[PDB]
Amino acid sequence: ELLKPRTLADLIRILHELFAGDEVNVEEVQAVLEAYESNPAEWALYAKFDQYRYTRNLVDQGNGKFNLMILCWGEGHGSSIHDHTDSHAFLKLLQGNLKETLFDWPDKKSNEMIKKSERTLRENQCAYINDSIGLHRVENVSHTEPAVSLHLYSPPFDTCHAFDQRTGHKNKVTMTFHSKFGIRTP
Ligand SMILES: [Cl-]
Ligand SMILES: [Fe+3]
């Protein structure tokens, strides 16, 4: 029985219930993420920005079933075109707007990766992707407003692939944390 999360802490408790088993009800998870109304005081501890690129700030390790983290995107900061390592990936905007561009998996032939679609994700909205849907790039295209998003990955993963938009060629990247549980982790 899904109830509205009253706070970030309440959301986390509810997520631990939704991930208590071995499968994932994507629609329920997305609905509860969407229902949490972003309250900046509740997540200020995790919102640690870097001047030069977006940061990943671990919030909860989900008893091993998921990683929940907050990503902080300066003006103009964005990702590579990337996959999600056979995991579910949920993205909820806490502050600002992000542009999500979708791409198909490349063929073996070296070719330009052409976007399949794009959308602007707005405050409090929750998007979802997995490798069966495709690849994406996520970008804060604003010149004036930093963005903050809440990401849930299940199972957790610490590597993924970045794709060269010119060729479709992929390279494995290891994902790093800027902080964990509010503590900067050099
Ligand atoms: Cl993502
Ligand atoms: Fe992603």
Side-chain angles (χ1 to χ4, degrees), residues 1-5 7-107 109-179 181-186:
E1 196 89 308
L2 304 187
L3 294 177
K4 183 187 160 68
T7 64
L8 180 60
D10 200 40
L11 176 56
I12 294 170
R13 192 264 307 163
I14 295 158
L15 294 170
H16 278 254
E17 300 176 2
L18 295 173
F19 288 87
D22 293 323
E23 304 288 317
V24 178
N25 187 315
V26 170
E27 297 80 11
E28 288 188 349
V29 173
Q30 189 162 4
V32 307
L33 285 166
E34 193 143 297
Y36 167 59
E37 289 180 27
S38 178
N39 179 0
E42 288 170 3
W43 50 255
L45 177 64
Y46 311 110
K48 299 183 203 290
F49 286 75
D50 180 88
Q51 178 178 340
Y52 306 109
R53 60 155 289 180
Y54 74 94
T55 62
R56 305 171 79 255
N57 300 283
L58 183 66
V59 176
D60 193 82
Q61 283 181 133
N63 267 78
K65 287 284 184 52
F66 67 78
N67 277 344
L68 187 70
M69 55 191 78
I70 283 172
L71 271 57
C72 302
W73 314 77
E75 294 97 330
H77 290 177
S79 76
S80 63
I81 300 171
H82 64 271
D83 61 3
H84 301 86
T85 311
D86 287 310
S87 295
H88 300 282
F90 301 83
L91 191 167
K92 184 206 171 68
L93 265 293
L94 298 178
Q95 176 185 295
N97 297 283
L98 293 169
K99 182 169 78 157
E100 184 191 34
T101 306
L102 303 189
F103 294 86
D104 284 322
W105 284 90
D107 294 328
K109 180 170 183 176
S110 176
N111 247 315
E112 172 92 14
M113 302 181 67
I114 303 301
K115 59 173 177 226
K116 86 154 74 86
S117 59
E118 72 178 56
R119 62 174 160 169
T120 296
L121 301 172
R122 306 197 178 277
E123 277 184 24
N124 279 312
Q125 293 179 355
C126 187
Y128 172 75
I129 196 168
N130 65 42
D131 289 350
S132 67
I133 291 173
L135 306 172
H136 73 182
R137 188 198 297 280
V138 176
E139 301 173 276
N140 181 13
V141 301
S142 181
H143 288 264
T144 53
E145 298 298 339
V148 183
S149 53
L150 180 66
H151 297 243
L152 187 161
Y153 300 118
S154 185
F157 61 90
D158 50 31
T159 68
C160 74
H161 300 98
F163 297 75
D164 174 15
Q165 187 171 359
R166 305 285 81 86
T167 61
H169 293 173
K170 70 178 157 56
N171 286 288
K172 191 172 184 187
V173 299
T174 295
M175 298 168 91
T176 49
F177 285 121
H178 191 69
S179 69
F181 314 119
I183 306 300
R184 185 81 176 73
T185 56

